[PDB]
């Protein structure tokens, strides 16, 4: 309402419109190559900027600060796991995907295994995973921040956001979104750094964070309701392992073996096997450019600790009776939610700490985060639908109809997400961040197991790969069923879910589900007849440098030997910086 906020929002919109129009003037959007794969023309800095921007949503500010506030600094685990896994994309997965000449990841499995059915299954499962784990977090986290910072209606505002992100998406092709993601990555990091600075000034620096956070409890621990009573000292006090990434393997809220192995499996699906991330690598200029952009995205994926997690811990220090509330009546008074108020962590700091001009910039940061992420989902889902499912229903389609079907899917998945918004508004507090990471851990590991055996074990065949995936979903729903039948509650109001169902952390069941899906794939593969080498050139890690004539069930990934040496050194130095920081906060 102060004019400076409107001028900052207008400036940010004019940058985004300006770079959109420049990208459409530059690139060709008339063909499937151009509109869906950016012409296979993107150099390193848009690839890095877009990998980062397509990941970092409104969820990352709401969820990481909120969980920061609630549970200390182990949530950085989610971000920092990514650092290691982006190196597996650039060096192992990205080469095979370039030599296969695929537009979608289901199409890679069609080439590797060769039935009709694996491609169809993985397309339809990916569509359900994006409605559940990716749209839901962005719509929800959007809605939190609008209700807290602005107070505007969280239905109509989500419709208006979904509406503008539709137009942003359908107007340009992957080339528009990746150049716009270099503007959005600048604003996201820039404004996030300004708020980090104001926050750290208010607690009295970095020393201030680490000497005030363990004391920072609410003074209201007594309910008016009998059979809640005195809230336990366990569940309003901050956790005594709040300053440690690496927490206890049986009693930790995120056990260290589950963090490292179990997140690597679920991060493997997210970064190496999934249409949304891998489309940025399929539109690279050359493998050297992909590897270079994977290093940039890596250094950026350290930033979220210092920009989201530690700010949310500072909100606990500054507003403990509102951010760290435990009594149901008090929490219902503060932000509407009986189960807690962690979620207001990040958007209290924007309301309280930011002056007249920079409140606008922090609105532009949330907008930048949300639009980049929802557009990347709408484009990647468009590709999945068009290329895998619509080319089934119409085989002799051609590149004019396929772009129209691409554009009409973006309209349809916006309307499905509007229909879905009330189900996601049913999530009460930080239940959604926890459930997203559960769902990911119950459906992703079989896919992680298939793409690793598809890429590294040439004996694995279509019967194995398919019944591996379906056995996977049976095991994954045996837990994704029973739990959600019980509900969630809080530490104050525990759910009645049995210990033998819920006591195993979801990231440990990721490790079990991966090895059981792995073992099933290999067993059924080794029983049934194998696929010979003539079907498999440039589709497997062994044979990415083949030159032999494949029989189907620019493919040229060499490198300026000097520039190879550059990106290889920066991979090892970027892992050294990773490893140091995991040590520092262990």
């Amino acid at each position: 309402d102060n004019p400076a906020d409107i001028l900052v929002i207008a400036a940010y919109f004019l940058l985004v419109i300006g770079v959109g129009l420049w990208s459409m003037c530059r690139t060709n959007r008339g063909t499937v190559g151009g509109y869906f794969l950016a012409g296979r023309s993107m150099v390193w800095w848009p690839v890095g900027a877009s990998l980062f921007a397509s990941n970092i949503g409104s969820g990352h500010f709401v969820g990481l600060a909120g969980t920061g506030a609630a549970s200390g600094l182990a949530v950085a685990g989610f971000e920092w796991n990514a650092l290691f896994v982006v190196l597996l994309l650039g060096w192992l997965f990205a080469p095979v995907y370039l030599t296969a000449g695929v537009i979608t990841m289901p199409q890679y499995l069609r080439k590797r295994f060769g039935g009709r059915r694996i491609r169809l299954y993985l397309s339809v499962l990916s569509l359900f995973l994006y409605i559940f784990t990716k749209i839901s977090v962005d719509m929800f986290s959007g809605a939190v921040f609008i209700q807290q910072a602005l107070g505007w209606n969280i239905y109509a505002s989500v419709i208006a956001l979904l509406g503008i992100t539709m137009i942003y998406t359908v107007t340009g092709g992957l080339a528009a979104l990746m150049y716009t993601d270099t503007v959005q990555t600048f604003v996201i990091l820039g404004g996030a750094c300004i708020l980090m600075g104001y926050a750290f000034h208010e607690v009295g620096g970095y020393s201030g964070l680490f000497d005030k956070y363990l004391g920072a409890a609410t003074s209201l621990t007594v309910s008016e309701d009998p059979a809640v009573g005195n809230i336990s000292s366990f569940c309003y006090r901050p956790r005594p392992d709040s300053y440690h990434l690496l927490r206890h393997p049986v009693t930790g809220d995120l056990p260290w073996p589950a963090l490292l192995l179990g997140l690597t499996i679920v991060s493997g699906w997210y970064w190496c096997s999934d249409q949304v991330i891998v489309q940025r690598c399929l539109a690279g200029k050359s493998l050297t450019h992909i590897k270079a952009g994977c290093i940039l995205c890596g250094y950026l994926k350290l930033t979220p600790m210092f920009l989201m997690v530690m700010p949310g811990m500072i909100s606990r220090i500054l507003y403990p009776d509102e951010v760290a509330c435990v009594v149901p009546e008090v929490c219902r008074r503060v932000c509407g939610t009986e189960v807690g108020c962690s979620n207001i962590a990040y958007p209290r700091l924007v309301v309280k700490l930011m002056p007249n001009g920079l409140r606008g910039l922090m609105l532009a940061v949330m907008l930048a985060a949300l639009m980049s992420s929802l557009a990347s989902i709408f484009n990647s889902s468009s590709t999945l639908f068009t290329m895998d499912i619509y080319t089934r229903l119409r085989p002799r389609a051609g590149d004019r109809e396929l772009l129209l079907v691409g554009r009409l899917w973006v309209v349809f998945i916006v309307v499905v997400s509007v229909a879905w918004l009330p189900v996601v508004q049913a999530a009460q507090g930080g239940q959604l961040f926890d459930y997203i990471q559960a769902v990911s851990s119950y459906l992703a590991p079989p896919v992680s197991a298939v793409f690793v055996l598809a890429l590294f074990v040439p004996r694995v065949n279509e019967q194995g790969a398919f019944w591996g995936l379906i056995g996977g979903l049976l095991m994954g729903l045996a837990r994704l069923i029973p739990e959600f039948s019980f509900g969630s509650g809080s530490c104050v109001q525990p759910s009645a879910c049995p210990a033998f169902l819920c006591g195993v952390h979801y990231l440990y069941f990721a490790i079990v589900l991966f090895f059981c899906s792995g073992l099933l794939t290999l067993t059924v593969s080794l029983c049934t007849a194998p696929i010979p080498r003539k079907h498999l050139h440039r589709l497997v890690f062994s044979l990415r440098h083949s030159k032999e004539e494949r029989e189907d069930l620019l493919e040229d990934i060499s490198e300026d030997p000097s520039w190879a040496r550059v990106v290889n050194l920066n991979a090892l130095l970027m892992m050294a910086v990773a490893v140091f920081l995991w040590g520092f906060y262990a």
């Binding site: 090892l572 892992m575 050294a576 490893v579 140091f580 920081l581 995991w582 040590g583 520092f584 906060y585 262990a586």
Partner: peptide, 29 residues
Amino acid sequence: QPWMQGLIAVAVFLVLVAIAFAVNHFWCQ
């Protein structure tokens, strides 16, 4: 001390990457 945990972490990482070169240098060629 946090800084020693950092340096120990790096040290162990550089041992494992030195091993990864060693193994592929002697067992792939």
